[PDB]
Enzyme design. Structure first.
Site, PDB file in Angstrom:
ATOM      1  N   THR A 197       0.795  -1.229   0.000  1.00 32.31           N
ATOM      2  CA  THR A 197       0.000   0.000   0.000  1.00 32.31           C
ATOM      3  C   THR A 197       0.830   1.283   0.000  1.00 32.31           C
ATOM      4  N   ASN A 253       5.852  -1.957   3.778  1.00 32.92           N
ATOM      5  CA  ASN A 253       4.987  -1.538   4.879  1.00 32.92           C
ATOM      6  C   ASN A 253       5.729  -1.584   6.205  1.00 32.92           C
ATOM      7  N   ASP A 266      26.340  -3.261 -14.204  1.00 36.01           N
ATOM      8  CA  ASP A 266      25.711  -2.594 -13.054  1.00 36.01           C
ATOM      9  C   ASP A 266      26.169  -3.220 -11.731  1.00 36.01           C
ATOM     10  N   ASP A 318      -4.173   1.212  -5.980  1.00 34.19           N
ATOM     11  CA  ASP A 318      -2.765   1.018  -5.679  1.00 34.19           C
ATOM     12  C   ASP A 318      -2.228  -0.384  -6.079  1.00 34.19           C
ATOM     13  N   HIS A 319      -2.982  -1.449  -5.812  1.00 38.43           N
ATOM     14  CA  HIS A 319      -2.540  -2.841  -6.111  1.00 38.43           C
ATOM     15  C   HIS A 319      -3.798  -3.703  -6.135  1.00 38.43           C
ATOM     16  N   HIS A 341      -1.625  -9.322  -0.618  1.00 39.57           N
ATOM     17  CA  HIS A 341      -0.949  -8.727  -1.759  1.00 39.57           C
ATOM     18  C   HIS A 341       0.462  -8.420  -1.340  1.00 39.57           C
ATOM     19  N   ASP A 348      22.195   0.040  -9.130  1.00 37.08           N
ATOM     20  CA  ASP A 348      21.366   1.255  -9.117  1.00 37.08           C
ATOM     21  C   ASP A 348      20.559   1.412 -10.394  1.00 37.08           C
ATOM     22  N   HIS A 390      -8.769  -8.534   2.497  1.00 40.27           N
ATOM     23  CA  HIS A 390      -7.931  -9.313   3.403  1.00 40.27           C
ATOM     24  C   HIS A 390      -8.724 -10.369   4.175  1.00 40.27           C
TER      25      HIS A 390
HETATM   26  C1  LIG Z   1      14.696   7.102 -10.802  1.00 40.66           C
HETATM   27  O1  LIG Z   1      14.614   8.513 -10.703  1.00 40.66           O
HETATM   28  C2  LIG Z   1      15.443   9.120  -9.723  1.00 40.66           C
HETATM   29  C3  LIG Z   1      15.127  10.625  -9.664  1.00 40.66           C
HETATM   30  O2  LIG Z   1      15.423  11.223 -10.918  1.00 40.66           O
HETATM   31  C4  LIG Z   1      16.914   8.856 -10.037  1.00 40.66           C
HETATM   32  O3  LIG Z   1      17.672   9.150  -8.895  1.00 40.66           O
HETATM   33  C5  LIG Z   1      18.591  10.249  -9.030  1.00 40.66           C
HETATM   34  O4  LIG Z   1      19.829   9.821  -9.552  1.00 40.66           O
HETATM   35  C6  LIG Z   1      20.888  10.772  -9.587  1.00 40.66           C
HETATM   36  C7  LIG Z   1      22.111  10.033 -10.127  1.00 40.66           C
HETATM   37  O5  LIG Z   1      22.180   8.737  -9.571  1.00 40.66           O
HETATM   38  C8  LIG Z   1      21.169  11.425  -8.216  1.00 40.66           C
HETATM   39  O6  LIG Z   1      22.105  12.496  -8.339  1.00 40.66           O
HETATM   40  C9  LIG Z   1      23.019  12.560  -7.211  1.00 40.66           C
HETATM   41  O7  LIG Z   1      22.567  13.418  -6.176  1.00 40.66           O
HETATM   42  C10 LIG Z   1      23.312  13.323  -4.966  1.00 40.66           C
HETATM   43  C11 LIG Z   1      22.672  14.239  -3.921  1.00 40.66           C
HETATM   44  O8  LIG Z   1      21.275  14.213  -4.119  1.00 40.66           O
HETATM   45  C12 LIG Z   1      20.551  14.837  -3.032  1.00 40.66           C
HETATM   46  O9  LIG Z   1      19.599  15.803  -3.477  1.00 40.66           O
HETATM   47  C13 LIG Z   1      18.483  15.288  -4.195  1.00 40.66           C
HETATM   48  C14 LIG Z   1      17.624  16.442  -4.730  1.00 40.66           C
HETATM   49  O10 LIG Z   1      16.732  16.976  -3.764  1.00 40.66           O
HETATM   50  C15 LIG Z   1      16.184  18.226  -4.247  1.00 40.66           C
HETATM   51  O11 LIG Z   1      15.061  18.073  -5.107  1.00 40.66           O
HETATM   52  C16 LIG Z   1      14.672  19.257  -5.812  1.00 40.66           C
HETATM   53  C17 LIG Z   1      15.007  19.116  -7.303  1.00 40.66           C
HETATM   54  O12 LIG Z   1      14.541  17.872  -7.788  1.00 40.66           O
HETATM   55  C18 LIG Z   1      15.269  20.530  -5.176  1.00 40.66           C
HETATM   56  O13 LIG Z   1      14.629  21.705  -5.646  1.00 40.66           O
HETATM   57  C19 LIG Z   1      15.176  20.467  -3.646  1.00 40.66           C
HETATM   58  O14 LIG Z   1      15.746  21.626  -3.070  1.00 40.66           O
HETATM   59  C20 LIG Z   1      15.824  19.184  -3.099  1.00 40.66           C
HETATM   60  O15 LIG Z   1      16.966  19.487  -2.323  1.00 40.66           O
HETATM   61  C21 LIG Z   1      17.707  14.300  -3.313  1.00 40.66           C
HETATM   62  O16 LIG Z   1      16.621  13.740  -4.020  1.00 40.66           O
HETATM   63  C22 LIG Z   1      18.616  13.185  -2.779  1.00 40.66           C
HETATM   64  O17 LIG Z   1      17.852  12.405  -1.873  1.00 40.66           O
HETATM   65  C23 LIG Z   1      18.406  11.096  -1.580  1.00 40.66           C
HETATM   66  O18 LIG Z   1      18.974  11.016  -0.283  1.00 40.66           O
HETATM   67  C24 LIG Z   1      18.057  11.371   0.748  1.00 40.66           C
HETATM   68  C25 LIG Z   1      18.801  11.465   2.074  1.00 40.66           C
HETATM   69  O19 LIG Z   1      19.414  12.736   2.156  1.00 40.66           O
HETATM   70  C26 LIG Z   1      16.868  10.397   0.781  1.00 40.66           C
HETATM   71  O20 LIG Z   1      15.868  10.853   1.674  1.00 40.66           O
HETATM   72  C27 LIG Z   1      16.262  10.226  -0.619  1.00 40.66           C
HETATM   73  O21 LIG Z   1      15.326   9.164  -0.618  1.00 40.66           O
HETATM   74  C28 LIG Z   1      17.343   9.996  -1.686  1.00 40.66           C
HETATM   75  O22 LIG Z   1      17.956   8.732  -1.472  1.00 40.66           O
HETATM   76  C29 LIG Z   1      18.061   7.910  -2.665  1.00 40.66           C
HETATM   77  O23 LIG Z   1      19.045   8.342  -3.601  1.00 40.66           O
HETATM   78  C30 LIG Z   1      20.378   8.394  -3.104  1.00 40.66           C
HETATM   79  C31 LIG Z   1      21.305   8.967  -4.175  1.00 40.66           C
HETATM   80  O24 LIG Z   1      21.424  10.364  -4.017  1.00 40.66           O
HETATM   81  C32 LIG Z   1      20.852   7.009  -2.643  1.00 40.66           C
HETATM   82  O25 LIG Z   1      21.988   7.167  -1.818  1.00 40.66           O
HETATM   83  C33 LIG Z   1      19.796   6.209  -1.863  1.00 40.66           C
HETATM   84  O26 LIG Z   1      20.110   4.835  -1.968  1.00 40.66           O
HETATM   85  C34 LIG Z   1      18.325   6.450  -2.261  1.00 40.66           C
HETATM   86  O27 LIG Z   1      17.920   5.550  -3.278  1.00 40.66           O
HETATM   87  C35 LIG Z   1      19.881  13.782  -2.135  1.00 40.66           C
HETATM   88  O28 LIG Z   1      19.565  14.370  -0.890  1.00 40.66           O
HETATM   89  C36 LIG Z   1      24.796  13.660  -5.182  1.00 40.66           C
HETATM   90  O29 LIG Z   1      25.527  13.297  -4.027  1.00 40.66           O
HETATM   91  C37 LIG Z   1      25.390  12.969  -6.427  1.00 40.66           C
HETATM   92  O30 LIG Z   1      26.640  13.552  -6.782  1.00 40.66           O
HETATM   93  C38 LIG Z   1      27.734  12.600  -6.678  1.00 40.66           C
HETATM   94  O31 LIG Z   1      28.017  11.890  -7.887  1.00 40.66           O
HETATM   95  C39 LIG Z   1      28.664  12.636  -8.917  1.00 40.66           C
HETATM   96  C40 LIG Z   1      28.834  11.776 -10.168  1.00 40.66           C
HETATM   97  O32 LIG Z   1      29.059  12.616 -11.281  1.00 40.66           O
HETATM   98  C41 LIG Z   1      29.995  13.203  -8.408  1.00 40.66           C
HETATM   99  O33 LIG Z   1      30.685  13.920  -9.410  1.00 40.66           O
HETATM  100  C42 LIG Z   1      29.696  14.103  -7.206  1.00 40.66           C
HETATM  101  O34 LIG Z   1      30.880  14.696  -6.713  1.00 40.66           O
HETATM  102  C43 LIG Z   1      29.010  13.265  -6.123  1.00 40.66           C
HETATM  103  O35 LIG Z   1      29.921  12.261  -5.712  1.00 40.66           O
HETATM  104  C44 LIG Z   1      30.292  12.369  -4.319  1.00 40.66           C
HETATM  105  O36 LIG Z   1      29.915  11.217  -3.579  1.00 40.66           O
HETATM  106  C45 LIG Z   1      30.519  10.022  -4.058  1.00 40.66           C
HETATM  107  C46 LIG Z   1      29.844   8.817  -3.414  1.00 40.66           C
HETATM  108  O37 LIG Z   1      28.473   8.829  -3.752  1.00 40.66           O
HETATM  109  C47 LIG Z   1      32.035  10.094  -3.826  1.00 40.66           C
HETATM  110  O38 LIG Z   1      32.684   8.929  -4.293  1.00 40.66           O
HETATM  111  C48 LIG Z   1      32.601  11.336  -4.532  1.00 40.66           C
HETATM  112  O39 LIG Z   1      33.967  11.505  -4.216  1.00 40.66           O
HETATM  113  C49 LIG Z   1      31.803  12.608  -4.189  1.00 40.66           C
HETATM  114  O40 LIG Z   1      32.108  13.059  -2.882  1.00 40.66           O
HETATM  115  C50 LIG Z   1      24.423  13.014  -7.623  1.00 40.66           C
HETATM  116  O41 LIG Z   1      24.361  14.329  -8.136  1.00 40.66           O
HETATM  117  C51 LIG Z   1      19.852  11.901  -7.581  1.00 40.66           C
HETATM  118  O42 LIG Z   1      20.068  12.255  -6.232  1.00 40.66           O
HETATM  119  C52 LIG Z   1      18.790  10.800  -7.616  1.00 40.66           C
HETATM  120  N1  LIG Z   1      17.517  11.268  -7.085  1.00 40.66           N
HETATM  121  C53 LIG Z   1      16.712  10.541  -6.298  1.00 40.66           C
HETATM  122  C54 LIG Z   1      15.436  11.215  -5.876  1.00 40.66           C
HETATM  123  O43 LIG Z   1      16.958   9.392  -5.919  1.00 40.66           O
HETATM  124  C55 LIG Z   1      17.156   7.385 -10.362  1.00 40.66           C
HETATM  125  O44 LIG Z   1      18.436   7.237 -10.946  1.00 40.66           O
HETATM  126  C56 LIG Z   1      16.108   6.788 -11.282  1.00 40.66           C
HETATM  127  N2  LIG Z   1      16.278   5.358 -11.316  1.00 40.66           N
HETATM  128  C57 LIG Z   1      16.484   4.739 -12.474  1.00 40.66           C
HETATM  129  C58 LIG Z   1      16.644   3.240 -12.424  1.00 40.66           C
HETATM  130  O45 LIG Z   1      16.532   5.349 -13.544  1.00 40.66           O
HETATM  131 CA   LIG Z   2      25.335   1.177 -12.028  1.00 40.06          CA
HETATM  132 CL   LIG Z   3       6.677  -5.023   3.597  1.00 37.12          CL
END
Ligand SMILES: *[C@@H]1O[C@H](CO)[C@@H](O[C@@H]2O[C@H](CO)[C@@H](O[C@@H]3O[C@H](CO[C@H]4O[C@H](CO[C@H]5O[C@H](CO)[C@@H](O)[C@H](O)[C@@H]5O)[C@@H](O)[C@H](O[C@H]5O[C@H](CO)[C@@H](O)[C@H](O)[C@@H]5O[C@H]5O[C@H](CO)[C@@H](O)[C@H](O)[C@@H]5O)[C@@H]4O)[C@@H](O)[C@H](O[C@H]4O[C@H](CO)[C@@H](O)[C@H](O)[C@@H]4O[C@H]4O[C@H](CO)[C@@H](O)[C@H](O)[C@@H]4O)[C@@H]3O)[C@H](O)[C@H]2NC(C)=O)[C@H](O)[C@H]1NC(C)=O
Ligand SMILES: [Ca+2]
Ligand SMILES: [Cl-]
Ligand SMILES: O=C(/C=C/c1ccc(OC(F)(F)F)cc1)N1C[C@@H]2[C@H](C1)[C@H]1CN(C(=O)c3ccc4[nH]nnc4c3)C[C@@H]21
Ligand SMILES: [Cl-]
Ligand SMILES: [Cl-]
Ligand SMILES: [Cl-]
Length: 808
Positions: A159, A180, A683, A308-309, A420, A687, A265
């Site tokens: 859900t 959930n 991959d 939803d499902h 579900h 991711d 359910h």
């Molecule tokens: C499905 O769709 C989604 C959405 O489009 C796709 O997911 C996106 O994928 C992007 C690339 O993988 C990724 O870009 C990242 O962003 C990192 C930081 O991101 C934070 O900010 C996000 C934006 O929030 C804002 O939203 C609006 C605009 O939309 C603004 O106006 C607002 O003001 C908001 O601030 C935010 O969404 C994101 O949230 C995640 O983390 C939260 C905790 O803080 C969670 O609550 C939330 O659920 C999110 O968590 C998920 O995603 C994260 C990945 O970010 C993951 O860890 C979790 O497992 C979870 O699934 C953030 O708060 C940023 O750090 C990245 O930059 C790094 O990589 C580049 C590569 O070029 C480097 O150059 C750069 O320096 C940096 O690297 C650094 O860190 C490295 C280690 O990671 C290190 O080695 C290096 O040295 C560096 O220090 C990059 O820009 C998007 O964040 C992501 N969005 C979402 C929503 O997930 C997804 O790909 C699609 N799926 C498929 C299959 O297609």
């Molecule tokens: Ca990958």
């Molecule tokens: Cl569950």
């Protein structure tokens, strides 16, 4: 602590929230226990019922009544929904013939058609046909508007994951609500249904529709409703909100019904006790539409009816117990039910090993109703691995079954006949979609689609710019009368080279051998044309794929196939070829069994070598274009180039061989020719996106040859199968898969048997969208067709499920 001393008088269902310790009057304060003392009194009135009887007409306004039948109630915006019908001789919305809504017919002050989301929990897709007799409002909606046979939910078909996917266009792995019930190790915190941690904001990622709306100056109703608020009060509140002045009035609204999931359910999906909850959803819909009609908004508002499902037949006697498989059952935590997730109970235990756990759970019983998986080995179409809240070990459960830890958990923690949460391609899990209003089409059926795509559409219907999500914007324009969004092809980032013969055989020191030194203007000038690309019109039917990242690669042409060869990964990124219906399967001749030829178009530096595979005892090799389908003995040699070669585990060669030797030909016979596009996927961080060179975790030993985690194929033909694939004029038809490249066939329990009994079933499990392969490869297919780009976007989101008809 809340100082609930304040009042709700004048503030019933206020649209903004007030911070503690003031008392709240919103449709959610009950769940927080922070409502003002007078909430129930003034806001939750019930007197006299929800309907205007023949004697209530023109009454004296009594404020104690739930709704009003007075003369002034139209002005106050608080009549009963049946007011006009009973007191003014009007008809119900459902009794009117449905006339097409060609343009929005809105009252002055409405700057856009409002959107109302009517979400129904557990509403199985088959209910639309099967309960059609007892749902006349929903049936008018369905048949006058735009509808799909079903809408595919996300996995797990639970859900919260699905409701929040609906609001964000994100996969649960990306929005963070991956079930959930969840544990987050970084937080060191847990997420429950019964509790108050679930309210904490850190759990919820992405940007839900009502926040997207707010940030762009479109006003939203508050989507969530306290359970104790009855459905009738929910409808009237929505209507009251719609009566507000232009500057205060929201543009988007939601309604939630706990039914039919709740009864589902208890009684199962088709329990005789199911007719009534379905009757009651339809009446609520009636109430809403009669209410809109009173407001003169029934030809102005866009209404979405979405579930939803679904719901499956599940009983307690169909439970599998982990205690009948494992020894140390007390060293694991299990999240049970229609899926399983396993972790170490205590982290300060170093004698915990997931591989032993998985081995103990693998084909240990002939009847087994669950399958263990490391999350990265789950099928890619589930997108269920890239979140720290997703346990390393995952059990996928047969439809109709449960998993539990010990029997004591099932009888002391039957009572239920429905559940579900299963694989989202399972028929019983599909839900409904119906769109009705000026912006939706009239009497239109659209193909099934996934709920990830709705966020974009709802953004469109509202003039909003969607937050970045997993939908494919423009893939659902065919639901709409008028779009607002016109998708555009991404630009190619890397242009290819077209290498000619540049190198001599003897420059190559790849340790490969081929008995090929046996072989005239006739058939020697001809093969010149082949290597230049004369036959490409046959094998590359929809344009070359565009590379959407920075890289160096070469187009290699051949009589039978064409490849995009990567100098970085030392292998093709893609290989494309057409197998007509008339094509024949040959075998690999005896002398050419171990044959690998140097490609004089590509330097030894950017080539694989046979020596590495000789030295790597685990690893072997295969070919992307299959030798078996060469069109002549002479063309067959092209198939043995080092540049058509890819690493493969022996165990995976059995899968691949059968796909290339048997299935491609079969598909070509069934579909009247197929174009096949195949390649590697990397991959290693699970991711769903392409690894870059520096993210590869495994190389063919003693070399820079990276090992793919998966192999894909895209198999295309004509939707009109009377036309050959290579002369298709109209719409195209497609199926795809992403096979995991694994060193054992532990996933297939019948694998020690012949490939004809297990291989095709494995392939069906790993069916994929062409869109999934795009993200994983950084390519873009179908660049040059005669079709509209909207149509092609829809093709790319297509998933071939291998489930039989809905209903049978
Ligand atoms: C499905 O769709 C989604 C959405 O489009 C796709 O997911 C996106 O994928 C992007 C690339 O993988 C990724 O870009 C990242 O962003 C990192 C930081 O991101 C934070 O900010 C996000 C934006 O929030 C804002 O939203 C609006 C605009 O939309 C603004 O106006 C607002 O003001 C908001 O601030 C935010 O969404 C994101 O949230 C995640 O983390 C939260 C905790 O803080 C969670 O609550 C939330 O659920 C999110 O968590 C998920 O995603 C994260 C990945 O970010 C993951 O860890 C979790 O497992 C979870 O699934 C953030 O708060 C940023 O750090 C990245 O930059 C790094 O990589 C580049 C590569 O070029 C480097 O150059 C750069 O320096 C940096 O690297 C650094 O860190 C490295 C280690 O990671 C290190 O080695 C290096 O040295 C560096 O220090 C990059 O820009 C998007 O964040 C992501 N969005 C979402 C929503 O997930 C997804 O790909 C699609 N799926 C498929 C299959 O297609
Ligand atoms: Ca990958
Ligand atoms: Cl569950
Ligand atoms: O008022 C809402 C949601 C409104 C909404 C409207 C449109 C939406 O989509 C859009 F974004 F697109 F508009 C999204 C949300 N609620 C309160 C309820 C509901 C969410 C859950 C079910 N539940 C179980 O406790 C529950 C229910 C069914 C179950 N089956 N198995 N376990 C279960 C647990 C308690 C929770
Ligand atoms: Cl095997
Ligand atoms: Cl790269
Ligand atoms: Cl069904």
């Amino acid at each position: 602590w809340t100082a609930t001393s304040g009042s709700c008088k004048g503030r019933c269902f206020e649209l903004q929230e007030v911070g503690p310790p003031d008392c709240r009057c919103d449709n959610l304060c009950k769940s927080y226990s922070s409502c003002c003392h007078d909430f129930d009194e003034l806001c939750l009135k019930t007197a006299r019922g929800w309907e205007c009887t023949k004697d209530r007409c023109g009454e004296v306004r009594n404020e104690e009544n739930a709704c009003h039948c007075s003369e002034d109630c139209l002005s106050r915006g608080d009549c009963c929904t049946n007011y006009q019908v009973v007191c003014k001789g009007e008809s119900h919305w459902v009794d009117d013939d449905c006339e097409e809504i060609k343009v929005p017919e809105c009252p002055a002050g409405f700057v856009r058609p409002p959107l109302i989301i009517f979400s129904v929990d557990g509403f199985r897709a088959s209910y639309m046909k099967k309960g059609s007799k007892v749902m006349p409002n929903i049936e008018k909606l369905r048949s006058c508007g735009t509808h799909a046979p079903y809408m595919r939910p996300v996995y797990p078909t639970k859900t919260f994951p699905n409701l929040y996917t609906l609001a964000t266009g994100l996969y649960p792995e990306s929005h963070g609500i991956v079930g959930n019930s969840m544990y987050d190790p970084v937080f060191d915190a847990s997420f429950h249904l019964r509790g108050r941690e679930k309210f904490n904001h850190r759990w919820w990622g992405g940007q839900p529709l009502w926040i997207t709306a707010t940030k762009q100056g479109v006003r939203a109703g508050t989507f969530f409703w306290s359970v104790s608020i009855p459905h009738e009060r929910r409808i009237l509140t929505i209507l009251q909100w719609l009566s507000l002045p232009d500057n205060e009035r929201p543009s988007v609204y939601a309604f939630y019904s706990e039914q039919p999931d709740f009864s589902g359910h208890k009684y199962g999906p088709f329990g005789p006790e199911m007719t009534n909850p379905l009757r009651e959803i339809d009446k609520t819909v009636g109430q809403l539409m009669d209410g809109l009609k009173q407001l003169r908004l029934h030809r102005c508002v866009n209404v979405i009816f979405v579930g939803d499902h679904g719901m499956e037949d599940v009983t307690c006697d169909r439970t599998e117990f982990l205690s009948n498989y494992l020894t140390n059952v007390d060293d694991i935590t299990l999240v049970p039910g229609t899926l399983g997730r396993i972790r170490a109970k205590s982290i300060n235990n170093s004698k915990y090993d997931p591989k032993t756990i998985i081995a103990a759970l693998t084909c240990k019983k002939p009847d087994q109703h669950f399958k263990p998986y490391m999350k990265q080995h789950l099928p890619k179409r589930l997108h269920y691995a890239n979140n720290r809240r997703i346990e390393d070990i995952h059990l996928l459960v047969d439809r109709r079954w449960h998993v539990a830890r010990k029997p004591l958990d099932v009888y002391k923690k039957c009572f239920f006949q429905g559940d579900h949460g299963f694989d989202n391609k399972v028929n019983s899990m599909q839900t409904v979609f119906v769109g009705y209003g000026p912006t939706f089409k009239y009497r239109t059926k659209v193909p099934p689609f996934e709920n990830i795509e709705l966020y974009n559409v709802m953004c469109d219907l509202l003039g909003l710019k969607p937050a970045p999500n997993n939908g494919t914007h423009g893939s659902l324009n065919h639901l709409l009368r008028t779009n607002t969004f016109r998708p555009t092809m991404p630009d190619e980032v890397s242009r290819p080279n077209y290498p000619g013969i540049m190198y001599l055989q003897s420059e190559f020191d790849l340790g490969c051998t081929c008995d090929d030194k046996v072989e005239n203007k006739l058939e020697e000038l001809n093969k010149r044309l082949h290597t230049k690309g004369s036959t490409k019109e046959r094998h590359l039917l929809y344009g070359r794929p565009a590379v959407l990242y920075r890289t160096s690669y070469d187009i290699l042409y051949h009589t039978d196939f064409e490849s995009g060869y990567s100098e970085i990964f030392l292998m093709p990124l893609w290989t494309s070829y057409t197998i007509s219906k008339q094509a024949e399967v040959s075998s690999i001749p005896e002398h050419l069994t171990n044959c690998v030829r140097p490609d004089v178009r590509v330097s030894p530096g950017f080539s694989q070598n046979c020596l590495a595979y000789k030295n790597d005892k685990q690893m072997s090799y295969g070919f992307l274009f299959p030798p078996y389908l060469s069109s002549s003995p002479e063309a067959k040699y092209d198939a043995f180039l080092v540049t058509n070669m890819v690493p493969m585990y022996p165990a995976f060669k059995r899968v691949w061989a059968y796909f290339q030797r048997v299935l491609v030909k079969k598909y070509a016979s069934e579909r009247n020719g197929v174009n096949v596009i195949s390649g590697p996927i990397f991959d290693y961080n699970y991711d769903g996106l392409r690894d870059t060179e520096d993210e590869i975790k495994q190389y063919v030993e003693g070399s820079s040859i990276p090992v793919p985690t998966h192999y894909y194929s895209i198999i295309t033909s004509c939707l009109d199968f009377t036309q050959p694939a290579d002369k298709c004029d109209g719409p195209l038809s497609v199926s795809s898969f992403i096979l995991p490249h694994r060193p054992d066939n532990d996933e297939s329990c019948n694998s020690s048997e012949d490939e004809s009994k297990w291989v095709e079933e494995l392939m069906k499990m790993h069916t994929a969208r062409v869109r999934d392969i795009e993200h994983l490869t950084g390519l873009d297919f179908y660049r040059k067709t005669s079709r509209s780009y909207s149509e092609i976007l829809t093709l790319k989101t297509y998933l071939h499920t291998y489930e039989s008809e809905i209903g049978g």
